Amino acid sequence: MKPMYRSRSWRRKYVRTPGGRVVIHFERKKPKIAHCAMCGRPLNGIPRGRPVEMRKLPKTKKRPERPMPHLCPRCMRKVMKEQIRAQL
Amino acid sequence: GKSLIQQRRGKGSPTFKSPSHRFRGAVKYIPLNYTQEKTLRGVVEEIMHDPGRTAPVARVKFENGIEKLIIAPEGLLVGQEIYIGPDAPIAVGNTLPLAKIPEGTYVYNIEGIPGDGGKYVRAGGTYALVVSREPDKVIVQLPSGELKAFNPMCRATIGVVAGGGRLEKPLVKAGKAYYKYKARNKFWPTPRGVKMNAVNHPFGGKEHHPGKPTTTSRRAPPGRKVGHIAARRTGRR
Amino acid sequence: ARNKPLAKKLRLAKALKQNRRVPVWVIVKTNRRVLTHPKRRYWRRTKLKE
Amino acid sequence: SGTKKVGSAGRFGARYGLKIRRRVAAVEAKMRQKHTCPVCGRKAVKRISTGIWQCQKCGATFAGGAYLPVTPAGKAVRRITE
Amino acid sequence: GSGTATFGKRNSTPTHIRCRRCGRVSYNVKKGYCAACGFGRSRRLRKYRWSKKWKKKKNAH
Amino acid sequence: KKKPIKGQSRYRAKIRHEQKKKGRHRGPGSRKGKKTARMGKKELWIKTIRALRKELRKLKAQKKIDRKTYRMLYIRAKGGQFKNKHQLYLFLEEHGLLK
RNA sequence: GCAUGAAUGGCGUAACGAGGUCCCCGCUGUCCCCGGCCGGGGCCCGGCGAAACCUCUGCCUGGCGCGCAUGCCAGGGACC
RNA sequence: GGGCCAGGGUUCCACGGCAAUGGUCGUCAGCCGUGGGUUAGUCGGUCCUAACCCCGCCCGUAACUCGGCGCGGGGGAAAGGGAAACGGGUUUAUAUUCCCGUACCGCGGGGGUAGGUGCGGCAACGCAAGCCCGGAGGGUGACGCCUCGGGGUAGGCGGACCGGCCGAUGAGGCCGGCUAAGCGUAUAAGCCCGGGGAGUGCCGUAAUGGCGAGAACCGGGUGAAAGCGCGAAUGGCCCCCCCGUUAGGGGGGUUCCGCCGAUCCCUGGGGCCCGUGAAAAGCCCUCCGGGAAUUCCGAUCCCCCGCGACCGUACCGAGAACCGACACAGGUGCCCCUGGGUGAGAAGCCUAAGGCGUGUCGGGGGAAACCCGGCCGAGGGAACUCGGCAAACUGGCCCCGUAACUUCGGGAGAAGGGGUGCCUGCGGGUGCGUAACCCGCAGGUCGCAGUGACUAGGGGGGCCCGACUGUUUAAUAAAAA
RNA sequence: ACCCGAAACCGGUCGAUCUAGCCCGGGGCAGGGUGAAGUCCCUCAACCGAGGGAUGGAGGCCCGCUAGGGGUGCUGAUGUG
Ligand SMILES: [Zn+2]
Ligand SMILES: [Zn+2]
Ligand SMILES: [Zn+2]
């Protein structure tokens, strides 16, 4: 294989073609799941994908429909409560 | 003759240069104009391990929006609030001018002159003791045991540097020493002048003994100051 | 070798075009005086300057 | 877990000397215990890095000594400052 | 070692390549200057009176 | 023409496999690797403990044992008292914990 | 103690070593004492086809001699 | 053997040839002559930044093409980050580039629609969920070493069935029985969200473990590699028939079950650091201000249309295409990949595929002596020699057994002893299994020899030195240095 | 200064594709053994305790013609290779 494909950042898969040939398919690894900005636990409603896969989706299919989608529900509720109590 | 390791170090070659790109950054105080006459409150975001510091570092975000790196004192807690200024309370992790620090207190990261950013008591596990306070100077006992006078406006942090007791455990392995010294690019392993050649060291020779007394004068030229330099005495007392 | 810059490729092209024998009509015109030129090359023995 | 003397230093076999092995075993035995959390008061504190400790229950992260969460100097300064 | 087996490791990047100014294959590619005419290190040509190559170029020696 | 491939036959291998299944070609003089190499340790323990846990859960579901007995047998199985569920059932029969 | 000796360290030391050294069981062609067999060269035939080196030459005994001579003296022997 | 860097630069292909080259010959060739051959929006450069480098100002120098801190600018990876294509076919030589089929990405335009002005869930969340300019925040890009569980796929094995070959038109063996991107589709672990309210404690893992700071237990949300459907049987593969003077034309099938299973992918635990294992471009989301919009504005949603620049692309990739003066037993590159049996094994041996007979001078021969490499040797067993140099003994696995000393970890596989094949039949572990792997028992029997080839330690006791692993005189010293 | 020959000295430049050191970014090491910390279980007794059985995978650990790296002895072949 090429030296560029000898790197382990590529995923190698052996695939049999309909014509009976054996070929190697190379793919790039997916990014890891998003994490909360305050506690670091995994988030929900945000699909994992490379930039092309992310741009293949509409806006509402990438983040949950609730305030502060960058925080997990516990942190979001906590921040809302602190803001409300600070206002009074 | 040939050069010594100390002579070759002064030329700044990559064999002797510090790898100051894998470190977290310099640890200096915020500029003195913010601290003078005003007290700033910050929150500790994270505590990390600086590759070469011998002490953990911490990130502090201040209310004015400035993010800074500080030397974490022992017992510093993530998410806690700290204060810097003349009106700061006397607690671990708070920075105050030396005039407002009561006698008998443990301090670290003391500015040599007001506003330099901190120069003294920065290694892990070290602290200094405030001895006396005067309108013109403040006396502190340093880790080396010397009593030093500082300007009353010099800033210091209350507490003890985290990471003490590091020398309690032996290094055991040459591999452990290799990793420890490679982390900061210190010359390791080290050779011996007696086993060097005569062309290389003042002590070099076929017989592995120093041909002259090992106490060298303070007035010796470069390339000669080896062994015990300007030693007041030698041996075990 | 697989990846080549254009300028180096053009220089190699010039060398390849240079490497050829003297025309028979040139030999006839010169009356067996001009038989060869100093730019003849064998790819495995005499190497290029670049 | 069944060794008379070597303890944690049993991985070294018959190397590095009696004094070094004893010191390593003692330091590691004292370090790898569970320590009381300054926040939640429960024995769930483990060393994350050199001088950094974290509680496994409430997640509190703090800075301490190289091999112990609290050193004598830290205890003295905490007592002085109250 | 140090001989025939050593000479087999000459398959890396060449030290010198062609120079755009003087036309000779003397351009230090890694450092970025010409060892013959000084291109990339000086605006003026690299001429030394102990050297006879520039005179040889025009048969002036 | 394209000549057909002369494949390698496995008739003798199949015959030997059948004999080994019956019990032949298995003596101490036919072994080259260590006993643990032939039947490793962590995998054997995993198989045994998973079988024991599955059997205990099956018994609890069928209600042949109570919750306290299930807990005690779970602790014993983790401790390694039983080398197989035959020994587990022997223990149950001996102590009369099965209803 | 010609002329050891305490961090140019003294003594001891488990484990370790292609380090030097002595002994024991076992083993053997190391040896007594060498003999068979195999493959490749060597050898012959058909081809390609050099180099190191070369004052000219080229037999001995006893001698003279710059003191150990193919070449000189007296003898001996010798077909190519 | 297959693929492909650096380096080489036409050595690649066809035709026509043997004056020279090729360790011999040659009708052959990496040789000579004559004609050809490298086709990209998707592959790589081009973009980002790392170590680092350069230019301008400034300072020093008699001075500079010389030395230098700080400010401003730029560069810097063909194996780091990084938009988008995969089958079949075609040529003597190119193909992810040409032709056919089916797609994707970026920019711009046209027609609709969602939204501007909309809903379902207690919630986690499900949703097409307004346009343009500027800014901020979060996430991703973005990372070490050791180790284990779970899911999956290549590949392999056994059986049934349909064609073909071999075999005796017996038994049996062998061959073919294939499925790309793209599009649609969802669960596992992990993490959450409602209900619930425990301890003379319950729950769970391979293991560590979790619980009033909220456990068992009942529901749900989000979330990978894969599988499945279209693509796709008009394609590829195998077989059969008619025409066969050249040239061609048609007919059949391409289906299931079970087991093993990766060093190839996905996903979670745990452990270690006096060692902490990159940055930026880019992309997604949210939030702030500002602007246009009502017989109007307008998409991240659907349909259609147009455009997409420059350079590399042949070939070897090495016991003849690179470096070493060579068709050099070296080095670069073994840099990436591996069917069946025996076997712990990527060991040795045999063998399938693929390749080769070019690690290129041939012929003769009891055709010797002698040399190099190998096998055997009666009786003795180191008497050889500076010295057991060399050679020889032992050898795998199972079960008994194991000393002085000791830093209590070791020494240790100490030492030493017994067994090992084949056949017949039972028992056990995990398992739904009479699938697969592994562990025992009884009996019969053959040889000089049963780890029968291959693979495969000889051992013990004193003394000196250095604690150990490690390093060294590349090319006479590997050591106590 | 009849002609040739030195080891050496001095100036300015050229080299880290060999090799030495260090920095940034990457690729690799079949199979087997031993069994440290840690986490435990069971039995008999109970004033002491004694015995047995697991799990766990650490090591500049061990065997190893895996790959790769090194170069002890034969002072072996070769030594106009
Ligand atoms: Zn959160
Ligand atoms: Zn806590
Ligand atoms: Zn130039």
PDB file of all heavy atoms in Angstrom, chain H residues 70-79:
ATOM      1  P     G H  70      13.185  37.385  21.960  1.00  0.00           P
ATOM      2  OP1   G H  70      12.413  36.609  22.960  1.00  0.00           O
ATOM      3  OP2   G H  70      13.370  36.844  20.592  1.00  0.00           O
ATOM      4  O5'   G H  70      12.509  38.821  21.838  1.00  0.00           O
ATOM      5  C5'   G H  70      12.213  39.594  22.991  1.00  0.00           C
ATOM      6  C4'   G H  70      11.794  40.991  22.614  1.00  0.00           C
ATOM      7  O4'   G H  70      12.903  41.687  21.992  1.00  0.00           O
ATOM      8  C3'   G H  70      10.673  41.082  21.595  1.00  0.00           C
ATOM      9  O3'   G H  70       9.399  40.946  22.197  1.00  0.00           O
ATOM     10  C2'   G H  70      10.907  42.441  20.946  1.00  0.00           C
ATOM     11  O2'   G H  70      10.385  43.480  21.760  1.00  0.00           O
ATOM     12  C1'   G H  70      12.432  42.536  20.969  1.00  0.00           C
ATOM     13  N9    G H  70      13.062  42.122  19.699  1.00  0.00           N
ATOM     14  C8    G H  70      13.702  40.929  19.480  1.00  0.00           C
ATOM     15  N7    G H  70      14.192  40.815  18.281  1.00  0.00           N
ATOM     16  C5    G H  70      13.863  42.011  17.665  1.00  0.00           C
ATOM     17  C6    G H  70      14.139  42.460  16.351  1.00  0.00           C
ATOM     18  O6    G H  70      14.745  41.864  15.454  1.00  0.00           O
ATOM     19  N1    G H  70      13.635  43.733  16.125  1.00  0.00           N
ATOM     20  C2    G H  70      12.951  44.482  17.051  1.00  0.00           C
ATOM     21  N2    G H  70      12.534  45.692  16.658  1.00  0.00           N
ATOM     22  N3    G H  70      12.687  44.072  18.283  1.00  0.00           N
ATOM     23  C4    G H  70      13.170  42.835  18.525  1.00  0.00           C
ATOM     24  P     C H  71       8.092  40.710  21.299  1.00  0.00           P
ATOM     25  OP1   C H  71       6.974  40.337  22.199  1.00  0.00           O
ATOM     26  OP2   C H  71       8.458  39.810  20.179  1.00  0.00           O
ATOM     27  O5'   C H  71       7.778  42.154  20.709  1.00  0.00           O
ATOM     28  C5'   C H  71       6.546  42.419  20.064  1.00  0.00           C
ATOM     29  C4'   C H  71       6.679  43.529  19.055  1.00  0.00           C
ATOM     30  O4'   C H  71       8.080  43.815  18.805  1.00  0.00           O
ATOM     31  C3'   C H  71       6.118  43.225  17.679  1.00  0.00           C
ATOM     32  O3'   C H  71       4.712  43.371  17.615  1.00  0.00           O
ATOM     33  C2'   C H  71       6.886  44.191  16.790  1.00  0.00           C
ATOM     34  O2'   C H  71       6.356  45.502  16.902  1.00  0.00           O
ATOM     35  C1'   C H  71       8.264  44.171  17.451  1.00  0.00           C
ATOM     36  N1    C H  71       9.170  43.181  16.824  1.00  0.00           N
ATOM     37  C2    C H  71       9.734  43.446  15.573  1.00  0.00           C
ATOM     38  O2    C H  71       9.461  44.515  15.007  1.00  0.00           O
ATOM     39  N3    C H  71      10.561  42.534  15.013  1.00  0.00           N
ATOM     40  C4    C H  71      10.833  41.397  15.654  1.00  0.00           C
ATOM     41  N4    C H  71      11.653  40.519  15.074  1.00  0.00           N
ATOM     42  C5    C H  71      10.275  41.102  16.929  1.00  0.00           C
ATOM     43  C6    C H  71       9.462  42.013  17.470  1.00  0.00           C
ATOM     44  P     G H  72       3.808  42.147  17.108  1.00  0.00           P
ATOM     45  OP1   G H  72       2.432  42.345  17.625  1.00  0.00           O
ATOM     46  OP2   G H  72       4.529  40.886  17.413  1.00  0.00           O
ATOM     47  O5'   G H  72       3.777  42.336  15.527  1.00  0.00           O
ATOM     48  C5'   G H  72       3.270  43.531  14.957  1.00  0.00           C
ATOM     49  C4'   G H  72       3.720  43.704  13.528  1.00  0.00           C
ATOM     50  O4'   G H  72       5.143  43.984  13.482  1.00  0.00           O
ATOM     51  C3'   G H  72       3.563  42.497  12.621  1.00  0.00           C
ATOM     52  O3'   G H  72       2.237  42.303  12.162  1.00  0.00           O
ATOM     53  C2'   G H  72       4.558  42.799  11.511  1.00  0.00           C
ATOM     54  O2'   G H  72       4.035  43.777  10.625  1.00  0.00           O
ATOM     55  C1'   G H  72       5.698  43.434  12.303  1.00  0.00           C
ATOM     56  N9    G H  72       6.720  42.441  12.678  1.00  0.00           N
ATOM     57  C8    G H  72       6.939  41.890  13.915  1.00  0.00           C
ATOM     58  N7    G H  72       7.920  41.033  13.923  1.00  0.00           N
ATOM     59  C5    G H  72       8.376  41.015  12.613  1.00  0.00           C
ATOM     60  C6    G H  72       9.424  40.275  12.013  1.00  0.00           C
ATOM     61  O6    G H  72      10.189  39.459  12.534  1.00  0.00           O
ATOM     62  N1    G H  72       9.543  40.562  10.659  1.00  0.00           N
ATOM     63  C2    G H  72       8.757  41.447   9.970  1.00  0.00           C
ATOM     64  N2    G H  72       9.029  41.584   8.665  1.00  0.00           N
ATOM     65  N3    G H  72       7.776  42.142  10.516  1.00  0.00           N
ATOM     66  C4    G H  72       7.643  41.878  11.831  1.00  0.00           C
ATOM     67  P     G H  73       1.706  40.814  11.878  1.00  0.00           P
ATOM     68  OP1   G H  73       0.250  40.890  11.605  1.00  0.00           O
ATOM     69  OP2   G H  73       2.207  39.939  12.968  1.00  0.00           O
ATOM     70  O5'   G H  73       2.446  40.391  10.532  1.00  0.00           O
ATOM     71  C5'   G H  73       2.214  41.102   9.326  1.00  0.00           C
ATOM     72  C4'   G H  73       3.157  40.678   8.225  1.00  0.00           C
ATOM     73  O4'   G H  73       4.535  40.889   8.627  1.00  0.00           O
ATOM     74  C3'   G H  73       3.127  39.214   7.825  1.00  0.00           C
ATOM     75  O3'   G H  73       2.021  38.869   7.011  1.00  0.00           O
ATOM     76  C2'   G H  73       4.470  39.047   7.131  1.00  0.00           C
ATOM     77  O2'   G H  73       4.430  39.608   5.827  1.00  0.00           O
ATOM     78  C1'   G H  73       5.363  39.928   8.002  1.00  0.00           C
ATOM     79  N9    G H  73       6.063  39.140   9.034  1.00  0.00           N
ATOM     80  C8    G H  73       5.754  39.026  10.365  1.00  0.00           C
ATOM     81  N7    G H  73       6.572  38.240  11.011  1.00  0.00           N
ATOM     82  C5    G H  73       7.472  37.808  10.049  1.00  0.00           C
ATOM     83  C6    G H  73       8.588  36.938  10.149  1.00  0.00           C
ATOM     84  O6    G H  73       9.020  36.356  11.147  1.00  0.00           O
ATOM     85  N1    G H  73       9.227  36.773   8.925  1.00  0.00           N
ATOM     86  C2    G H  73       8.840  37.368   7.751  1.00  0.00           C
ATOM     87  N2    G H  73       9.568  37.099   6.660  1.00  0.00           N
ATOM     88  N3    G H  73       7.803  38.179   7.647  1.00  0.00           N
ATOM     89  C4    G H  73       7.170  38.353   8.824  1.00  0.00           C
ATOM     90  P     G H  74       1.403  37.390   7.095  1.00  0.00           P
ATOM     91  OP1   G H  74       0.179  37.359   6.258  1.00  0.00           O
ATOM     92  OP2   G H  74       1.324  37.014   8.528  1.00  0.00           O
ATOM     93  O5'   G H  74       2.503  36.467   6.402  1.00  0.00           O
ATOM     94  C5'   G H  74       2.761  36.576   5.012  1.00  0.00           C
ATOM     95  C4'   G H  74       4.051  35.902   4.612  1.00  0.00           C
ATOM     96  O4'   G H  74       5.130  36.300   5.496  1.00  0.00           O
ATOM     97  C3'   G H  74       4.085  34.386   4.675  1.00  0.00           C
ATOM     98  O3'   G H  74       3.421  33.761   3.591  1.00  0.00           O
ATOM     99  C2'   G H  74       5.579  34.102   4.715  1.00  0.00           C
ATOM    100  O2'   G H  74       6.150  34.233   3.423  1.00  0.00           O
ATOM    101  C1'   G H  74       6.081  35.258   5.580  1.00  0.00           C
ATOM    102  N9    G H  74       6.247  34.850   6.987  1.00  0.00           N
ATOM    103  C8    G H  74       5.456  35.149   8.067  1.00  0.00           C
ATOM    104  N7    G H  74       5.891  34.613   9.174  1.00  0.00           N
ATOM    105  C5    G H  74       7.031  33.916   8.801  1.00  0.00           C
ATOM    106  C6    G H  74       7.934  33.136   9.567  1.00  0.00           C
ATOM    107  O6    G H  74       7.903  32.894  10.776  1.00  0.00           O
ATOM    108  N1    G H  74       8.955  32.611   8.782  1.00  0.00           N
ATOM    109  C2    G H  74       9.092  32.809   7.434  1.00  0.00           C
ATOM    110  N2    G H  74      10.137  32.229   6.832  1.00  0.00           N
ATOM    111  N3    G H  74       8.259  33.535   6.713  1.00  0.00           N
ATOM    112  C4    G H  74       7.261  34.053   7.455  1.00  0.00           C
ATOM    113  P     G H  75       2.751  32.313   3.787  1.00  0.00           P
ATOM    114  OP1   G H  75       1.985  32.002   2.556  1.00  0.00           O
ATOM    115  OP2   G H  75       2.064  32.296   5.101  1.00  0.00           O
ATOM    116  O5'   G H  75       3.991  31.316   3.867  1.00  0.00           O
ATOM    117  C5'   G H  75       4.823  31.100   2.738  1.00  0.00           C
ATOM    118  C4'   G H  75       6.128  30.447   3.118  1.00  0.00           C
ATOM    119  O4'   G H  75       6.676  31.085   4.295  1.00  0.00           O
ATOM    120  C3'   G H  75       6.066  28.976   3.497  1.00  0.00           C
ATOM    121  O3'   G H  75       6.031  28.124   2.366  1.00  0.00           O
ATOM    122  C2'   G H  75       7.320  28.795   4.343  1.00  0.00           C
ATOM    123  O2'   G H  75       8.461  28.627   3.517  1.00  0.00           O
ATOM    124  C1'   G H  75       7.431  30.152   5.037  1.00  0.00           C
ATOM    125  N9    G H  75       6.967  30.137   6.438  1.00  0.00           N
ATOM    126  C8    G H  75       5.859  30.745   6.973  1.00  0.00           C
ATOM    127  N7    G H  75       5.749  30.558   8.261  1.00  0.00           N
ATOM    128  C5    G H  75       6.854  29.788   8.597  1.00  0.00           C
ATOM    129  C6    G H  75       7.279  29.267   9.849  1.00  0.00           C
ATOM    130  O6    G H  75       6.747  29.384  10.958  1.00  0.00           O
ATOM    131  N1    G H  75       8.458  28.541   9.733  1.00  0.00           N
ATOM    132  C2    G H  75       9.142  28.340   8.562  1.00  0.00           C
ATOM    133  N2    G H  75      10.264  27.614   8.623  1.00  0.00           N
ATOM    134  N3    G H  75       8.758  28.820   7.395  1.00  0.00           N
ATOM    135  C4    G H  75       7.615  29.527   7.483  1.00  0.00           C
ATOM    136  P     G H  76       5.268  26.713   2.431  1.00  0.00           P
ATOM    137  OP1   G H  76       5.507  26.003   1.152  1.00  0.00           O
ATOM    138  OP2   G H  76       3.881  26.963   2.889  1.00  0.00           O
ATOM    139  O5'   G H  76       6.022  25.913   3.582  1.00  0.00           O
ATOM    140  C5'   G H  76       7.345  25.433   3.403  1.00  0.00           C
ATOM    141  C4'   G H  76       7.862  24.786   4.663  1.00  0.00           C
ATOM    142  O4'   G H  76       7.969  25.776   5.717  1.00  0.00           O
ATOM    143  C3'   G H  76       6.970  23.711   5.258  1.00  0.00           C
ATOM    144  O3'   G H  76       7.123  22.459   4.621  1.00  0.00           O
ATOM    145  C2'   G H  76       7.382  23.710   6.723  1.00  0.00           C
ATOM    146  O2'   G H  76       8.606  23.013   6.896  1.00  0.00           O
ATOM    147  C1'   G H  76       7.637  25.196   6.961  1.00  0.00           C
ATOM    148  N9    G H  76       6.449  25.888   7.492  1.00  0.00           N
ATOM    149  C8    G H  76       5.489  26.535   6.756  1.00  0.00           C
ATOM    150  N7    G H  76       4.549  27.062   7.486  1.00  0.00           N
ATOM    151  C5    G H  76       4.910  26.745   8.786  1.00  0.00           C
ATOM    152  C6    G H  76       4.268  27.053  10.009  1.00  0.00           C
ATOM    153  O6    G H  76       3.224  27.686  10.195  1.00  0.00           O
ATOM    154  N1    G H  76       4.967  26.545  11.094  1.00  0.00           N
ATOM    155  C2    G H  76       6.133  25.831  11.015  1.00  0.00           C
ATOM    156  N2    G H  76       6.645  25.431  12.185  1.00  0.00           N
ATOM    157  N3    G H  76       6.745  25.534   9.881  1.00  0.00           N
ATOM    158  C4    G H  76       6.081  26.020   8.810  1.00  0.00           C
ATOM    159  P     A H  77       5.945  21.877   3.702  1.00  0.00           P
ATOM    160  OP1   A H  77       6.450  21.788   2.310  1.00  0.00           O
ATOM    161  OP2   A H  77       4.710  22.646   3.989  1.00  0.00           O
ATOM    162  O5'   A H  77       5.744  20.399   4.247  1.00  0.00           O
ATOM    163  C5'   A H  77       6.861  19.544   4.459  1.00  0.00           C
ATOM    164  C4'   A H  77       6.437  18.196   4.983  1.00  0.00           C
ATOM    165  O4'   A H  77       6.105  18.309   6.394  1.00  0.00           O
ATOM    166  C3'   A H  77       5.211  17.589   4.303  1.00  0.00           C
ATOM    167  O3'   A H  77       5.359  16.172   4.241  1.00  0.00           O
ATOM    168  C2'   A H  77       4.086  17.933   5.272  1.00  0.00           C
ATOM    169  O2'   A H  77       2.965  17.081   5.196  1.00  0.00           O
ATOM    170  C1'   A H  77       4.802  17.808   6.612  1.00  0.00           C
ATOM    171  N9    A H  77       4.177  18.555   7.706  1.00  0.00           N
ATOM    172  C8    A H  77       3.580  19.791   7.680  1.00  0.00           C
ATOM    173  N7    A H  77       3.102  20.169   8.841  1.00  0.00           N
ATOM    174  C5    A H  77       3.403  19.110   9.686  1.00  0.00           C
ATOM    175  C6    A H  77       3.168  18.882  11.052  1.00  0.00           C
ATOM    176  N6    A H  77       2.547  19.743  11.857  1.00  0.00           N
ATOM    177  N1    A H  77       3.597  17.718  11.582  1.00  0.00           N
ATOM    178  C2    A H  77       4.221  16.844  10.786  1.00  0.00           C
ATOM    179  N3    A H  77       4.500  16.943   9.492  1.00  0.00           N
ATOM    180  C4    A H  77       4.059  18.110   8.997  1.00  0.00           C
ATOM    181  P     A H  78       5.875  15.466   2.895  1.00  0.00           P
ATOM    182  OP1   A H  78       6.049  14.022   3.183  1.00  0.00           O
ATOM    183  OP2   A H  78       7.017  16.249   2.369  1.00  0.00           O
ATOM    184  O5'   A H  78       4.660  15.633   1.880  1.00  0.00           O
ATOM    185  C5'   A H  78       3.358  15.164   2.214  1.00  0.00           C
ATOM    186  C4'   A H  78       2.898  14.063   1.289  1.00  0.00           C
ATOM    187  O4'   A H  78       2.630  14.616  -0.029  1.00  0.00           O
ATOM    188  C3'   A H  78       3.890  12.921   1.082  1.00  0.00           C
ATOM    189  O3'   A H  78       3.177  11.691   0.963  1.00  0.00           O
ATOM    190  C2'   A H  78       4.539  13.277  -0.254  1.00  0.00           C
ATOM    191  O2'   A H  78       5.085  12.182  -0.956  1.00  0.00           O
ATOM    192  C1'   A H  78       3.371  13.909  -1.003  1.00  0.00           C
ATOM    193  N9    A H  78       3.769  14.855  -2.049  1.00  0.00           N
ATOM    194  C8    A H  78       4.747  15.814  -1.981  1.00  0.00           C
ATOM    195  N7    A H  78       4.877  16.519  -3.076  1.00  0.00           N
ATOM    196  C5    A H  78       3.919  15.992  -3.927  1.00  0.00           C
ATOM    197  C6    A H  78       3.551  16.308  -5.245  1.00  0.00           C
ATOM    198  N6    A H  78       4.129  17.270  -5.965  1.00  0.00           N
ATOM    199  N1    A H  78       2.556  15.594  -5.809  1.00  0.00           N
ATOM    200  C2    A H  78       1.978  14.629  -5.087  1.00  0.00           C
ATOM    201  N3    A H  78       2.235  14.238  -3.841  1.00  0.00           N
ATOM    202  C4    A H  78       3.229  14.967  -3.308  1.00  0.00           C
ATOM    203  P     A H  79       3.652  10.397   1.789  1.00  0.00           P
ATOM    204  OP1   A H  79       5.122  10.271   1.638  1.00  0.00           O
ATOM    205  OP2   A H  79       2.781   9.268   1.385  1.00  0.00           O
ATOM    206  O5'   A H  79       3.346  10.755   3.314  1.00  0.00           O
ATOM    207  C5'   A H  79       2.013  10.970   3.769  1.00  0.00           C
ATOM    208  C4'   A H  79       1.710  10.202   5.035  1.00  0.00           C
ATOM    209  O4'   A H  79       2.402   8.924   5.006  1.00  0.00           O
ATOM    210  C3'   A H  79       2.128  10.876   6.343  1.00  0.00           C
ATOM    211  O3'   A H  79       1.207  10.507   7.369  1.00  0.00           O
ATOM    212  C2'   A H  79       3.466  10.213   6.639  1.00  0.00           C
ATOM    213  O2'   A H  79       3.848  10.249   7.998  1.00  0.00           O
ATOM    214  C1'   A H  79       3.193   8.790   6.169  1.00  0.00           C
ATOM    215  N9    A H  79       4.388   8.011   5.843  1.00  0.00           N
ATOM    216  C8    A H  79       5.445   8.358   5.043  1.00  0.00           C
ATOM    217  N7    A H  79       6.362   7.426   4.954  1.00  0.00           N
ATOM    218  C5    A H  79       5.875   6.400   5.750  1.00  0.00           C
ATOM    219  C6    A H  79       6.377   5.130   6.075  1.00  0.00           C
ATOM    220  N6    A H  79       7.536   4.651   5.620  1.00  0.00           N
ATOM    221  N1    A H  79       5.639   4.354   6.896  1.00  0.00           N
ATOM    222  C2    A H  79       4.475   4.829   7.354  1.00  0.00           C
ATOM    223  N3    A H  79       3.900   6.003   7.122  1.00  0.00           N
ATOM    224  C4    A H  79       4.659   6.748   6.302  1.00  0.00           C
TER     225        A H  79
END
